[PDB]
């Protein structure tokens, strides 16, 4: 039949009092409605992904899509909270968290949010980079964009945008936030997938302009529409930023890539006053212990344009580097035993890489404080890996502690031309080359793949070739 | 329900210079705490009276304005669509040399304190210009103006990097060595991370609060 057979699935949402079974127990009457909504929701989604269902539900005359949209404007809280969940799944948008503030809900929809698949046990960097870095195809047609373009245009024609505006300014606090995010997602989806013709009546919202900053309408309704625009304004910034790296391994890969693509396209005086005043404020000398130093003032001293232990040959700076050298020494159990979920884990890891680069700047002078640091890292590898005559059961300690954040220290050293030469003297490439054939250790092989820099030639790519052809099958898959 | 008449009642009896001035201000501080988020429904109705206090005030030392600036800080996030007409009056109070020093002190304090709950990324060019021309005009306001400036550089991402030559001229000429500002500039000139730069200040505040 015409409008009574297929439209039966829309009954639970269109009818506020729906009774599917004439005879049923009243004990689970409340639960029966929830079961009907879940089953009917999947039916609506299923019939909107087939061409035989899209056309029949979007007929030019009286159609079921207008009834579905029309019932959304009715001030019913139970129906509105259900129809919004349907719209998110139709366009395949991630659901935000239930809240009454826009900021908390906005942070739950960012594309760069952490996922379980990004951990070391799962795809370490390969899984994370897929959802952050963009696909390397600018002309290949995406057939899924065509499907969303047609579906989005159908709802706009029937008046989806007008219905959402009514929901935002005339619903509950935790319902308007969900509608505000949905409206923002559609506008972003529509400015890059819809053609020019459909965009003339798209970014106008005629009904929203009626409820504007005017004293004629109720004052409470006036600010809700104004606040909705303010809340929706911040949604633009999130899309402007785009996805961002979450792990320092992927972060260092992007930094070196842009750095080497800008050096081919051919600040302070730092008197003695600046150092000594700042050095005494670091608290690393008088209070010879960690968890007391001001880590904000330590990074500034290291990555400052002119101070590199060479321009300013000061005895006090010699104390500063040697005092900090003791902290990062793998043998000195002060840093390797920190928990993985440490409160200052991110800041401490950055400074460690920020410190080994500082030493390399003073090639003639800082090599004395740098030669010892790399040697003790090699001695640490011979214990966890088990190549030396020692127990190889330290895998559990490596995963749960910050001792895994040492490949970053050695990875950031291979980037510079004078850093890879230093590795030859310390003989760390030989240690990395030997550990390629390890059946028991797999997490250790993942870290060394995503650590070295292969921009130049040398032994950096030599180790990579061995891993992808002489290793475990699971290890070679990640490579 | 009765807030409509209370605001209207305060309209007639809030004369610019009379005995009943502070008790009106003290009522505002108690009112905003009571509503605690919905005060924006009635804030614009009293703005015109509040605007003409920073230029029409015969009190010695501009005490009335100081007692009013301390009330603006309590508003917090209530004002979002009215900051464009209330902030320029604030920035007009500390850029005038003829103004008393205590009045200019509170104008700088009320900006960094208001930064803890509001976004001033859009209001960058409106208030930065008085700051750079105050660090050289007043040798005594350098200590307190840097706190307001540094608290604003934190919200701004790498967009402030182009302002370094504009500010460094004052620093080298007058030898201004601020510890907090030294940290912020280092992370911008030389990279620190990628997810921290160009970060929305409101998201960061929510993250720290939770």
Q: Please choose, from the candidates A379, A382, A401, A406, the residue with its C-alpha nearest in 3D space to the C-alpha of residue A392.
A: A382
Distances (CA, A) of A115 to A88, A235, A247, B196: 20, 21, 12, 19
What CA–CA distance (Å, rounded) separates A403 from A380?
A: 9
What residue has token string 């949010």?
A113
Q: Which two tokens stand for residue A41?
A: 């929701």
Residues comprising chain B, all counted: 210
How many Å lie between the alpha carbon of B33 and the closest alpha carbon of chain A? 19
Sign of CA dihedral A354, B206, A117, A477: negative
What CA–CA distance (Å, rounded) separates A226 from A208?
A: 10
Interface contacts (A, B; CB < 8 Å): 65
Method: cryo-EM
- Quote the Cα angle for A241-A245-A246, to 5°: 120
List, in sequence order, every beta strand (DSSP E) within A196-324. none
**Residue of chain A nearest B189, judged by CA positions:** A267
How many Å lie between the alpha carbon of A240 and the closest alpha carbon of chain B? 10
**Residue of chain B nearest A354, judged by CA positions:** B192
Q: Please choose, from the candidates A11, A23, A122, A123, the residue with its C-alpha nearest in 3D space to the C-alpha of residue A68.
A: A11
What CA–CA distance (Å, rounded) separates A458 from A421?
A: 10
What CA–CA distance (Å, rounded) separates A386 from A448?
A: 16
Residues comprising chain A, all counted: 479
Which are the contacts of A95, defined by CB distance < 8 A and separation ≥ 6? Answer: A85, A88
Q: Rounded to 5 degrees, what are φ and ψ at A339?
A: -70, 150
Give the residue from B154, B164, B179 with the most A CB atoms within 10 Å of its CB, the best one to mutate. Answer: B179
What CA–CA distance (Å, rounded) separates A470 from A466?
A: 5
Is residue A153 within 8 A of residue A53, CB to CB? The reply is: no
Contact A104 B179 (CB under 8 A): no
How many Å lie between the alpha carbon of B90 and the closest alpha carbon of chain A? 23
> Does the annotation place A290 within a ligand binding site?
yes
Question: SS3 string of A397-433?
Answer: HHHHEHHHCCHHHHHHHHCCHHHHHHHHHHCCHHHHH
What CA–CA distance (Å, rounded) separates A433 from A438?
A: 11
**Residue of chain A nearest B192, judged by CA positions:** A350
Could you please report the per-residue DSSP string of A251-271? HHHHHHHHHHTTTT-------
Q: Please choose, from the candidates A242, A85, A92, A111, the residue with its C-alpha nearest in 3D space to the C-alpha of residue A178.
A: A85
Could you please report the per-residue DSSP string of A116-167? GGGSSSS-SSHHHHHHHSPPS-SSS--HHHHHHHHHHHHHHHHTHHHHHHHH
- Number of alpha carbons in the 13 Å side-chain half-sphere of residue B62: 22
Chain A CB contacts of B168 below 8 Å? 267
Chain B CB contacts of A350 below 8 Å? 192-193
> Residue A339 forms beta bridges with which residues?
A401
**Residue of chain B nearest A246, judged by CA positions:** B195
Nearest to A267 among B187, B189, B198 (CB): B189
What residue has token string 């902030």?
B87
Running DSSP on this structure, what letter comes out for residue A457? -
Contact B177 A234 (CB under 8 A): no
Interface residues from chain B to A (CB-CB < 8 Å): 40-41, 80-81, 164, 168, 177, 179, 182-183, 186-187, 189-195, 198, 200, 202-203, 206-207
Sign of CA dihedral A366, A304, A295, A452: negative
Is residue A349 within 8 A of residue A339, CB to CB? The reply is: no
Running DSSP on this structure, what letter comes out for residue B111? H
What residue has token string 């610019």?
B16
Chain breaks in chain B (C to N over 2.5 A) after: none
B9 Cα distance to chain centroid? 28
Distances (CA, A) of A206 to A152, A219, B33: 18, 20, 37
């Amino acid at each position: 039949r015409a409008d009574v057979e297929l439209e039966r699935i829309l009954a639970p949402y269109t009818d506020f009092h729906y009774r599917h079974s004439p005879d049923t127990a009243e004990g689970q009457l409340k639960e029966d409605r929830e079961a009907r909504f879940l089953a009917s929701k999947m039916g609506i989604i299923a019939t909107f992904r087939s061409w035989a269902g899209i056309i029949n539900l979007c007929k030019p005359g009286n159609s079921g899509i207008q009834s579905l949209i029309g019932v959304l404007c009715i001030p019913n809280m139970e129906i509105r909270r259900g129809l919004l969940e349907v719209l998110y799944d139709i366009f395949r948008l991630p659901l935000p968290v239930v809240t009454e503030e826009f900021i908390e809900a906005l942070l739950s929809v960012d594309p760069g949010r952490f996922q379980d698949s990004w951990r070391l046990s799962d795809g370490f960097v390969a899984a994370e980079a897929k959802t952050i870095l963009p696909h390397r195809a600018r002309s290949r047609p995406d057939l899924m964009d065509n499907y969303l373009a047609l579906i989005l245009s159908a709802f706009i024609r029937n008046g989806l945008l007008e219905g959402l505006v009514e929901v935002i300014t005339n619903s509950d606090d935790h319902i308007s936030v969900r509608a505000t995010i949905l409206l923002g997602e559609l506008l972003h989806m529509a400015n890059t997938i819809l053609p020019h013709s459909h965009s003339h009546h798209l970014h106008c919202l005629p009904t929203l302009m009626n409820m504007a900053a005017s004293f004629d309408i109720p004052k409470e309704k006036r600010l809700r529409a104004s606040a909705a625009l303010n809340c929706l304004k911040r949604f633009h910034e999130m899309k402007k930023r785009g996805p961002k790296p979450y792990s320092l391994h992927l972060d260092h890969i992007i930094q070196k890539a842009i750095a080497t693509h800008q050096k081919r396209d051919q600040i302070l005086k730092d008197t003695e006053e600046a150092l000594l005043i700042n050095l005494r404020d670091s608290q690393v000398l008088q209070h010879k212990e960690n968890l007391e130093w001001n880590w904000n003032l330590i990074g500034t001293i290291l990555k400052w344009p002119n101070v590199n232990l060479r321009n300013y040959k000061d005895e006090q700076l010699h104390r500063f580097v040697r005092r900090l050298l003791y902290f990062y020494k793998p043998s000195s159990k002060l840093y390797a035993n920190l928990d993985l979920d440490f409160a200052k884990a991110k800041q401490l890891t950055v400074v460690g890489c920020q410190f080994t680069e500082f030493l390399l700047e003073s090639e003639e002078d800082g090599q004395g404080y740098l030669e010892d640091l790399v040697k003790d890292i090699v001695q640490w590898l011979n214990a966890s890996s088990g190549m030396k005559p020692e127990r190889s059961l330290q895998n559990n300690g490596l995963l749960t502690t910050l001792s895994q954040h040492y490949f970053l220290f050695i990875g950031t050293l291979s980037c510079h031309p004078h850093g890879v030469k230093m590795l030859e003297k310390c003989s760390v490439f030989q240690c990395l080359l030997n550990l390629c054939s390890l059946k028991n250790q797999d997490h250790l092989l993942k870290l060394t793949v995503s650590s070295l820099d292969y921009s130049r030639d040398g032994l950096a790519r030599v180790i990579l070739s061995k891993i992808l052809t002489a290793a475990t099958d699971a290890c070679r898959l990640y490579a | 329900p009765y807030m409509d008449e209370i605001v209207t009642l305060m309209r007639e009896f809030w004369v610019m210079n009379t005995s009943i001035q502070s008790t009106i201000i003290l009522l505002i501080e108690q009112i905003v705490v009571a509503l605690g988020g919905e005060f924006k429904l009635y804030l614009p109705q009293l703005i015109p009276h509040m605007l003409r206090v920073f230029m029409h005030d015969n009190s010695p030392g501009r005490i009335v304005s100081i007692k009013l600036l301390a009330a603006i800080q309590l508003f917090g996030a209530n004002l979002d669509d009215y900051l464009h007409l209330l902030l320029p009056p604030i920035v007009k109070l500390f850029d005038a040399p003829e103004a008393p020093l205590p009045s200019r002190k509170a104008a700088l304090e009320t900006v960094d304190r208001l930064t803890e709950s509001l976004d001033f990324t859009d209001y960058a060019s409106r208030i930065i210009h008085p700051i750079v021309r105050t660090l050289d005009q007043s040798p005594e306001l350098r200590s307190t103006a840097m706190d307001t400036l540094s608290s604003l550089v934190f919200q701004l991402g790498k967009k402030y990097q182009i302002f370094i030559p504009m500010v460094n001229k004052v620093l080298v000429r007058h030898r201004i060595n601020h510890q907090r500002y030294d940290v912020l500039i280092c992370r911008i000139v030389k990279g620190y991370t990628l997810a921290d730069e160009e970060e929305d200040p409101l998201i960061y505040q929510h993250r720290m609060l939770r």
